[PDB]
Swiss-Prot record, chain A:
Molecular function via GO: ubiquitin binding
Location(s), subcellular: Cytoplasm; Nucleus
Protein's UniProt keywords contain Nucleus: yes
Free-text function comment from the UniProt entry: Component of the 19S cap proteasome complex which acts as a regulatory subunit of the 26S proteasome, involved in the ATP-dependent degradation of ubiquitinated proteins.
Similarity section: Belongs to the RPN13 family.
Self-association state and partner proteins as the record states: Component of the 19S cap proteasome complex composed of at least RPN1, RPN2, RPN3, RPN4, RPN5, RPN6, RPN7, RPN8, RPN9, RPN10, RPN11, RPN12, RPN13, RPT1, RPT2, RPT3, RPT4, RPT5, and RPT6. The 19S subcomplex associates with the 20S proteasome subcomplex to form the functional 26S proteasome.
A single BP term in Gene Ontology: proteasome-mediated ubiquitin-dependent protein catabolic process
Domain Pru: 1-126
UniProt source species: Saccharomyces cerevisiae (strain ATCC 204508 / S288c)
GO CC annotation: nucleus; proteasome complex; proteasome regulatory particle, lid subcomplex; proteasome storage granule
Parent-protein residues present: 7 to 133 of 156
Protein name: 26S proteasome regulatory subunit RPN13
Other facts noted in the record for this chain: Present with 12200 molecules/cell in log phase SD medium.
From Swiss-Prot, chain C:
Domain of life: Eukaryota
PTM: N-acetylated by NAT1.
Biological role stated in the UniProt entry: Acts as a regulatory subunit of the 26S proteasome which is involved in the ATP-dependent degradation of ubiquitinated proteins.
Family: Belongs to the proteasome subunit S1 family.
Subunit structure: Interacts with UBR1.
Additional observations: Present with 4750 molecules/cell in log phase SD medium.
Protein known as: 26S proteasome regulatory subunit RPN2
Amino acid sequence: VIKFRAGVCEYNEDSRLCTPIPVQGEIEIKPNEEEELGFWDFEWRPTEKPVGRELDPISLILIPGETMWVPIKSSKSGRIFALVFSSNERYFFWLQEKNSGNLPLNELSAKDKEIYNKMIGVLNNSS
Amino acid sequence: ALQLFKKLKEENDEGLSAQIAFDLVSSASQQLLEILVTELTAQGYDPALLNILSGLPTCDYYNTFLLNNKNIDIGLLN
Amino acid sequence: VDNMTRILPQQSRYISFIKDDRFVPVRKFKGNNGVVVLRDREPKEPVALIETVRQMKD
Amino acid sequence: GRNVTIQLENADTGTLDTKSVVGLVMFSQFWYWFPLAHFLSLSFTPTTVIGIRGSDQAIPKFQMNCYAKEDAFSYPRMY
């Protein structure tokens, strides 16, 4: 299991507001094996700071290649983990990977090289 | 000590408040700092003042100096 | 003399900050060692910066 | 790392610094119980001008003019 700090950020497509709503917690990706599609679940659950948008624990299936990983989908704030299910399971998430503090940074986290690779790894590979 | 901070509240200049405070924490009693933080909390004063007066900011600045510029005699250990 | 170095007090007495340089202290320099708060003339200019240790560890 | 000195007092306001005073007395009596040696750490103060940006809290790298003979006040050798 692959843990990292992340919080929820509201999803949007009307105007692309996509401002983070702060929380802290953690995102937990479970590799699963369910079908050849992988269905690596992006679970979002508050382990901490439940204040802001609660986003009750829920696991989301992954259909690979349909998701579009785009770093600045909002194009207004960094660290936009965007998961695009063509508005069906579309949730947005905002990294808080302590490395320069919570602060939104363009092109994801401060550990630039690492998180680019992490992102290819989950989306592309299917268990 | 309190009255001095109230004047600078009105200015809303962060730079000046900080500079005064940094000199005050060095000198000031362990006792003095502790009652002063309470008082400022109840005014509504910015939390940035309260943090310097807790003294952990200065601990961090002084820690940074030591790590980078340390010239270790290796002969001590041998 | 670069900022955030060991400076003896004797050297420190004779220090005057360049006024053209961005960093000039809010109020006059102590004239001696310790933490001195600078006014940043332009944040916009990029400066190589050393994050405070607390943040480095987070 | 050869960058610390023991401050007698905060001569800035001319009132005794609390830390150095206690430190020194607890160190000085050590004949009886040897571990009392460690109290001298508490009197140490580093001498360094640290610039602070008063609104971001980060140390800028910059250089100041210092009327000095650099050679005289440069670091001693590595012992």
